[PDB]
Amino acid sequence: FAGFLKPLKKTVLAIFLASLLYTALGIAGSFYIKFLFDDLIKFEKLNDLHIISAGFAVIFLLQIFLNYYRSILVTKLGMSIDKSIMMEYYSHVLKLPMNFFNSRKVGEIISRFMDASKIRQAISGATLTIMIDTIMAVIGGILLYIQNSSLFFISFIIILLYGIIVTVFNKPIQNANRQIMEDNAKLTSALVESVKGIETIKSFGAEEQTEKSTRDKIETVMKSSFKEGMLYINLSSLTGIVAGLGGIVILWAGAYNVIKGNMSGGQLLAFNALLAYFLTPVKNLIDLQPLIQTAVVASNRLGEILELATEKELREDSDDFVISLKGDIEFRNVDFRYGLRKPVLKNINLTIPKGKTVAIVGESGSGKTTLAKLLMNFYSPEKGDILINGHSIKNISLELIRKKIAFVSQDVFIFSGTVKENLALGNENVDMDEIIKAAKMANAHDFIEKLPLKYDTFLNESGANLSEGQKQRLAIARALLKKPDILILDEATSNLDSITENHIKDAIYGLEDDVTVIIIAHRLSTIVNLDKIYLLKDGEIVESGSHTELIALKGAYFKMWKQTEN
């Protein structure tokens, strides 16, 4: 927080000077009730009364103008701070390891981001000014002590009671706020999941189940927040008791001093009026304390997220003295266990030549996609190395891996935007000619021409504006534009029809001359004129060779191949 406000130094100084002079003007104008009951009521003074009233009115007007200026500056400062914190949090969230996103739900992250609004409203143009008034009431307290001692000691006892009440109510408020935030995060995650699955929910008539679950979660949220409501009512009642009893006792003691001839009759009124510049800021700060505690809890949750190491993490002094990812894939002694579920990869030893198309075939439960994820550092192997062109993949920087390796995941995702934006995701500077070239290469031009617009149409949410095969064609078109060294075509041929499948398959074997294409697919319509086919029995590679070599031996590949032909 300190670093965010470091550049803005003149604003803070102007705020402090404006607040100081505002407090001085308020203290000066608080003497109106003393001047009224000492030299303007006992004697029949009229012109002096009018002059004094006008002077105090113009002093108050100057005071309120200064308050307006200070409030504007405070609002500007707070909004800048909120911008900095929110942008920093989001920029850090977009750089977390992929194992974080597979455990936590989307709703938790969305709720923890949007909880920064509570931080925004707790440092707004009111709470910060109230804190400034609280810290500046020291001058008023000093002057109030100078006026009289016993009533000042009574006010000091009131301040001590305030402090004790605040200290006692420090932990329960935080606990209640954190519980409410956690329950609200659960509710948000459940609602996001339900809205994303609404199609299945309506298809299967699951309205009642989701309604009951959300009702239970809402009940939990309301229970926690009602506990917080009682916890705040207790503090409010205690603070009101202390404030009112202090006021009554200070009035009684002032009257006692008046009777004994310690102060004049009007100085008690001056003390009472000036008490609004010593006790009222503290009472307002105490009344706003729950808001500050909520802001503290939200900031602590944001810091809990920010504590996680970034996606870089174990980069191990990368070896950027390289030009491209051209070479041999050297999966050797590779094991991966998904972090305490069960082993999936059991010592896989495979080799891919320096530029060729290879295909990985296996059962549904085999870790075929796991190899693709491991090959681009989404995860890290439990044992062994990868050795992209004789050098370990760890020594290569993550940016180069993500830039020179093209991936087509099984779950094709298209963001909401123009087809120009979708076909150019990480590029941001590719001209149009390459766009048409890639679209025609992946057979994604014919449909995109027959649209209300051309390369400018809007796509709703996760590409709901198109069909599944259409989304697959767009996604496979996008990956071609990276001009990659390794193209991991991961089941990018599932939803495509026969004519489109044949066209795109004929197009794939024409990609330049220097690219390693790993076709993770089990269509078996393709994978017939390939250099090597890798078959894995859900734990490791068992059969290697080309199509003719695999069909020559009557093994698992023969068993899979015989039923596909008929």
Next chain:
Amino acid sequence: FAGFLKPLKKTVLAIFLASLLYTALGIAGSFYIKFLFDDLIKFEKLNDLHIISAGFAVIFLLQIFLNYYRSILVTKLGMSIDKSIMMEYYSHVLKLPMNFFNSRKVGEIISRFMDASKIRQAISGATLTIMIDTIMAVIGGILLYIQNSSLFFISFIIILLYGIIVTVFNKPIQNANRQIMEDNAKLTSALVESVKGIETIKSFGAEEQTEKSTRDKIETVMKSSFKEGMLYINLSSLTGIVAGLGGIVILWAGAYNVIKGNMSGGQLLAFNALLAYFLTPVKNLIDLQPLIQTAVVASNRLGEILELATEKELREDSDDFVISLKGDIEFRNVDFRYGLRKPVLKNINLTIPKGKTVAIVGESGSGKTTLAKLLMNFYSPEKGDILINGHSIKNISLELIRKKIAFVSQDVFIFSGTVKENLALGNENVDMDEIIKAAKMANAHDFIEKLPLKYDTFLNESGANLSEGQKQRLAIARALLKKPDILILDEATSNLDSITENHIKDAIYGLEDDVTVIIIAHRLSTIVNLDKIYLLKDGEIVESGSHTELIALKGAYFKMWKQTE
């Protein structure tokens, strides 16, 4: 308005009585300064001073006690009302037509549901006690008029100025709140979409572009927020000027009256002291006005959705005489302008027979998935009807259609929780034997009986705990467990190996329970001996028939078969 007073009336009466007693006790206790400067200072009466001070302290303690009681009751009432509003809104959202979900983004719906918190903040304990004090200050005003009858005019002028200021500042706060809430909804939508697509974003290195887009959205949100904050600052400054000038004028006029002898010097002090029960509640309400405006705009944004017609309402009527959906499926001449874009379907005539198994095939631009969604009335046909067993689909109860038709969507969605729950999305009163039977039928028992905790593993959101093929097998098992009549296998074997594919095909072929099976597949190898094949291209049934008939005809199906082989 709301319709909430019907169940909660005793609590309302208790709050009302507590408010009257609190106001009366405060008015009575305000006279302390008058009794101090009129009867206890001119005539030294320390013995009576202590008694009066103790009595007023007791009065204040009682006043705080009833304030605590009223605050408790108001907090409970607000909690109940917020629960009612939240549940009503969610229950209405869950049963909206699919056009609403197709058009509107997820984040917008999430944000305008979360706005229920902003609706809550204005029905809290303090925000309602301030309003009840404002409405109860009539007694204080009456006593003010009785006491002085001349200084009350200045208070009336102050309240008139407050009303003028609020009437001026009503609309711009409303507009700024609308703008900031809409911008925040857009930012939330972008955030949700980016977090969901983080996989592709990381794969393609598009972190910088998404960061810049989110930065721009945050910046426009903050621009609206700063405009609203400047408006709030202006309103607060004018209110403070009015309050302070009014107080100074009260003091000046009281001093003038005291000099003229029309009223005592302690009566002025009492007037200024008890003005806090007629002018301070008004100022507190005027300061809280932004929260009321935020609640109003949030409630209006909820109402925007709430006025939409639910899916069950669009239906004209229903017929009780239908109990089973088994029979023929007759797609009469039907055309479907899919949301004004293009005619994906036009002049379609299908005559699917009684309970059998048929396939619909074509290029990946046809209306196969659209036809399947029309069969479940996910969309309303523009012109035509889908006759089922001599009954039009429009005149059938929606829940019967949903329950008797199983759909294996291409976007296989697996909800977080127990796998048993993931196989029991629909009916709940299902024994565990049926679940394992369905899993065995869909070739899912073998891989599911290797998990660390059998049918109890907690799968993550969207079924990321398993593979896409395993998710499809789970969906097939769940659809089979539903025990349907018009089971639609929409490419249920997209990425299943030929082993599991053959097993599922054998299970489907051997089902034989008078179930009309529609298999929308791109793999012809699973259709070679599958009754009648409907070839659909450009929204037309160019030709149909059996596999041998289509081979003999030598149409597009023959070309696709030759290319695949």
